[PDB]
Amino acid sequence: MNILVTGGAGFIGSHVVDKLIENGYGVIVVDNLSSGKVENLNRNALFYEQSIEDEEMMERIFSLHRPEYVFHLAAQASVAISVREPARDAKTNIIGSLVLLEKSIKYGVKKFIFSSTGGAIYGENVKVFPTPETEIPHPISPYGIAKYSTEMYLEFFAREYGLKYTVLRYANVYGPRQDPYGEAGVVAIFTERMLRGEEVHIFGDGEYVRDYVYVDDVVRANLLAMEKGDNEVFNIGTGRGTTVNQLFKLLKEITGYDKEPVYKPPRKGDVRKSILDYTKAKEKLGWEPKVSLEEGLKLTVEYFRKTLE
Amino acid sequence: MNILVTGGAGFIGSHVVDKLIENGYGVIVVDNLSSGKVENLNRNALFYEQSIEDEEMMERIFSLHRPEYVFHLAAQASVAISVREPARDAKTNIIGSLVLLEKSIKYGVKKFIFSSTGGAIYGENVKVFPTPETEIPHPISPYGIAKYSTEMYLEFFAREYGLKYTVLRYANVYGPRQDPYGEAGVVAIFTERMLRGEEVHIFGDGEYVRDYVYVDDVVRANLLAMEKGDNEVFNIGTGRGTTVNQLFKLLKEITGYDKEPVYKPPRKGDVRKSILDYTKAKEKLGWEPKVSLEEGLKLTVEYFRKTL
Numbered sequence: 001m002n003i004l005v006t007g008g009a010g011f012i013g014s015h016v017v018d019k020l021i022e023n024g025y026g027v028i029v030v031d032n033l034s035s036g037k038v039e040n041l042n043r044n045a046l047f048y049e050q051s052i053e054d055e056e057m058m059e060r061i062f063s064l065h066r067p068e069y070v071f072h073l074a075a076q077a078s079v080a081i082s083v084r085e086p087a088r089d090a091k092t093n094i095i096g097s098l099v100l101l102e103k104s105i106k107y108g109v110k111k112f113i114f115s116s117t118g119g120a121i122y123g124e125n126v127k128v129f130p131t132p133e134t135e136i137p138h139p140i141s142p143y144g145i146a147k148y149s150t151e152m153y154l155e156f157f158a159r160e161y162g163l164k165y166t167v168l169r170y171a172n173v174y175g176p177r178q179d180p181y182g183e184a185g186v187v188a189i190f191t192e193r194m195l196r197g198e199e200v201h202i203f204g205d206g207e208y209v210r211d212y213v214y215v216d217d218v219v220r221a222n223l224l225a226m227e228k229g230d231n232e233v234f235n236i237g238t239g240r241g242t243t244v245n246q247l248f249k250l251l252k253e254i255t256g257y258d259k260e261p262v263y264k265p266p267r268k269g270d271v272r273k274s275i276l277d278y279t280k281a282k283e284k285l286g287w288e289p290k291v292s293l294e295e296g297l298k299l300t301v302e303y304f305r306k307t308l309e
Numbered sequence: 310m311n312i313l314v315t316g317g318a319g320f321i322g323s324h325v326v327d328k329l330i331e332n333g334y335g336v337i338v339v340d341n342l343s344s345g346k347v348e349n350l351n352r353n354a355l356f357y358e359q360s361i362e363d364e365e366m367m368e369r370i371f372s373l374h375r376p377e378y379v380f381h382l383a384a385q386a387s388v389a390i391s392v393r394e395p396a397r398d399a400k401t402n403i404i405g406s407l408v409l410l411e412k413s414i415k416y417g418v419k420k421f422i423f424s425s426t427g428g429a430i431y432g433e434n435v436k437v438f439p440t441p442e443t444e445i446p447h448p449i450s451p452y453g454i455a456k457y458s459t460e461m462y463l464e465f466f467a468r469e470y471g472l473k474y475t476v477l478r479y480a481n482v483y484g485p486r487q488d489p490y491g492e493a494g495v496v497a498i499f500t501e502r503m504l505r506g507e508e509v510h511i512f513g514d515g516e517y518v519r520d521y522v523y524v525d526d527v528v529r530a531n532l533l534a535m536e537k538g539d540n541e542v543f544n545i546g547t548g549r550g551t552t553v554n555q556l557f558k559l560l561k562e563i564t565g566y567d568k569e570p571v572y573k574p575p576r577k578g579d580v581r582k583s584i585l586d587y588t589k590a591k592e593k594l595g596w597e598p599k600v601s602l603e604e605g606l607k608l609t610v611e612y613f614r615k616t617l
């Protein structure tokens with residue numbers, strides 16, 4: 001069976017590729033290496049260094065390999081970049097998705113499994129925590145609007161053509177291969193700076209709450225979505241909130257870092273609190289996180305240590 | 310004062326241009342003539358035959374003319390077509406809007422007035438009519454999804470840069486210069502068929518209810534949104550529902566058409582009923598329709614007779 005993984009050279013996508021390869025699937029990867037890395041690629045997967053919004057190239061790849069599933073992880077994944085360049089962001093995030101969906105219909109894809117976002121979708125005025133999928137989306141960033149627009153297009157493709165899909169709205173994903181450089185998640189930034197004994201910055205008062213979910217658990221969610229959760233949207237998170245202050249403390253203890261954090265002005269656009277309810281994923285996908293935050297942070301620090309040897 | 314009107318060679322946009330010119334504004338028009346027509350263009354406007362999604366070209370236009378207001382009417386504005394090539398549709402409908410908004414932010418535009426849609430945004434299970442802006446959006450067509458995505462981006466630009474905007478969600482717009490040969494626009498199709506004595510087709514049972522709003526009234530709402538209704542979404546419609554069968558009868562009486570309609574199979578995706586509550590526009594824009602349907606249909610027939 002052939003499987004297409006877009007964004008397979010990236011943080012989450014490369015782990016998805018590895019797992020599919022391990023389970024015996026034929027895997028085809030599309031990635032333009034805008035943020036992904038050649039080192040992340042699996043030598044057993046077929047690789048196309050190409051862009052998802054390239055209609056002729058996507059036409060060619062789908063016609064050759066007729067993937068039965070598409071795992072769509074390719075995205076402009078930085079919120080800050082989406083703010084600075086919203087048209088370019090939407091070209092990858094919306095138009096890119098629509099090209100893949102057009103080819104998926106044309107070439108008989110059975111199911112499209114889309115990586116979406118929990119944090120950038122529910123908006124800034126949520127009152128129910130942990131937050132369920134029944135909360136109406138109010139995205140405020142271009143990234144969140146693009147992800148939400150694409151989820152709506154998925155429902156269109158299901159209604160019009162009978163394409164099955166699953167949307168996975170991730171919380172804050174962290175772990176090995178997350179890039180600590182550029183537009184990085186705080187786990188990777190903190191871990192790398194602490195190991196190097198560099199200064200660590202906390203924005204605003206550090207009381208921002210997030211739901212940190214380990215990359216291996218997110219990969220398992222993707223695989224469970226192959227045969228379950230048809231035409232459903234799921235939060236993929238832990239339902240546990242952690243402030244940036246608490247996170248710094250955990251990582252400081254693990255790394256043996258011995259400096260205080262430097263408090264900096266608050267970051268524009270930061271939602272105050274994000275925690276996801278995963279009851280639905282538990283009931284319909286049989287999904288639950290297996291790696292606690294403390295276990296996950298230790299694994300993460302361990303991977304980064306090896307990079308520094 | 311300079312004003313940019315995108316889609317200014319189209320049905321609604323050409324009338325907006327006319328009204329601005331009449332009121333003494335300098336008007337720049339951007340239209341790629343994908344569905345618009347040179348014959349619609351006001352010769353007093355400065356015309357760029359260019360595409361809104363062209364960043365380099367929009368850079369030049371905004372940099373040169375520094376428009377104070379943008380009336381954004383350019384769209385792949387037809388619901389069929391959006392279904393078969395949604396990526397191409399979203400390139401005009403979403404990416405195009407985003408390019409205009411980036412340039413708007415960069416070159417100090419004061420207000421952006423966006424043409425959106427009522428019907429295709431509220432979706433197919435509405436229970437309250439006439440329908441207020443508080444009704445939760447559930448667009449299921451690529452056209453409605455794209456329009457709604459753009460509305461959401463407009464709020465981002467307002468929050469991030471202080472750009473002021475107004476969204477006008479039109480009902481079913483009809484009147485002079487609506488193209489009777491395109492995908493849609495039942496009023497223009499019926500009028501052209503009837504005046505030519507050709508067959509007239511009613512899809513399904515003809516009991517589909519729409520809210521027909523005259524183009525000159527839609528133009529007045531655009532102009533009222535220059536100074537009022539900052540950062541608000543408004544339904545622009547009449548609050549009155551008309552079946553296709555009723556529309557047929559009205560236009561048959563006006564044209565003197567002497568045939569019965571030919572019924573065809575129902576058209577896939579047609580919502581059963583769309584009627585918009587315009588109370589919010591009435592209060593905040595001071596807007597109301599000045600042209601009743603009967604009066605507007607007569608003006609439309611009047612115009613079509615002259616034009617073919």
Ligand SMILES: NC(=O)c1ccc[n+]([C@@H]2O[C@H](COP(=O)([O-])OP(=O)(O)OC[C@H]3O[C@@H](n4cnc5c(N)ncnc54)[C@H](O)[C@@H]3O)[C@@H](O)[C@H]2O)c1
Binds near residue numbers: 009034118
């Ligand atoms: N905490 C998180 O990391 C998080 C949270 C919520 C959602 N997500 C989503 O999960 C997916 C993967 O995220 P990630 O953390 O691994 O980021 P990532 O940057 O590491 O992976 C994205 C990959 O997509 C590639 N890419 C970007 N544009 C492309 C294009 N036009 N054509 C082909 N490839 C392109 C990049 O090169 C990159 O390898 C994304 O959809 C992202 O939005 C991630």
Ligand SMILES: NC(=O)c1ccc[n+]([C@@H]2O[C@H](COP(=O)([O-])OP(=O)(O)OC[C@H]3O[C@@H](n4cnc5c(N)ncnc54)[C@H](O)[C@@H]3O)[C@@H](O)[C@H]2O)c1
Binds near residue numbers: 342
């Ligand atoms: N007519 C209605 O009943 C109705 C109802 C709801 C919303 N609207 C909206 O009002 C606006 C105008 O509608 P209309 O009836 O006048 O349609 P229209 O097709 O006559 O006008 C659209 C104009 O935009 C131009 N255009 C399309 N793509 C372009 C691009 N990429 N770059 C530059 N120009 C481009 C077309 O050439 C055309 O002249 C649209 O946004 C439409 O979606 C119309």
Ligand SMILES: O=c1ccn([C@@H]2O[C@H](COP(=O)(O)OP(=O)(O)O[C@H]3O[C@H](CO)[C@@H](O)[C@H](O)[C@H]3O)[C@@H](O)[C@H]2O)c(=O)[nH]1
Binds near residue numbers: 171201203208267
């Ligand atoms: O050096 C740093 C970096 C981050 N933060 C704080 O850490 C928190 C989390 O930031 P970040 O790691 O950037 O996560 P989010 O901004 O929440 O982004 C998450 O949410 C995005 C939008 O939902 C996802 O989709 C992203 O991939 C995901 O990492 C925020 O409060 C930041 O203020 C710091 O204090 N110091």
Ligand SMILES: O=c1ccn([C@@H]2O[C@H](COP(=O)(O)OP(=O)(O)O[C@H]3O[C@H](CO)[C@@H](O)[C@H](O)[C@H]3O)[C@@H](O)[C@H]2O)c(=O)[nH]1
Binds near residue numbers: 387492498576
């Ligand atoms: O020959 C025809 C043509 C249309 N209809 C019917 O007329 C009604 C109105 O159709 P149409 O004129 O195509 O408009 P709509 O489909 O309602 O709606 C669109 O009107 C504009 C396009 O014409 C869109 O952009 C607006 O968003 C949306 O209101 C529908 O019930 C059709 O079934 C007929 O019966 N016979």
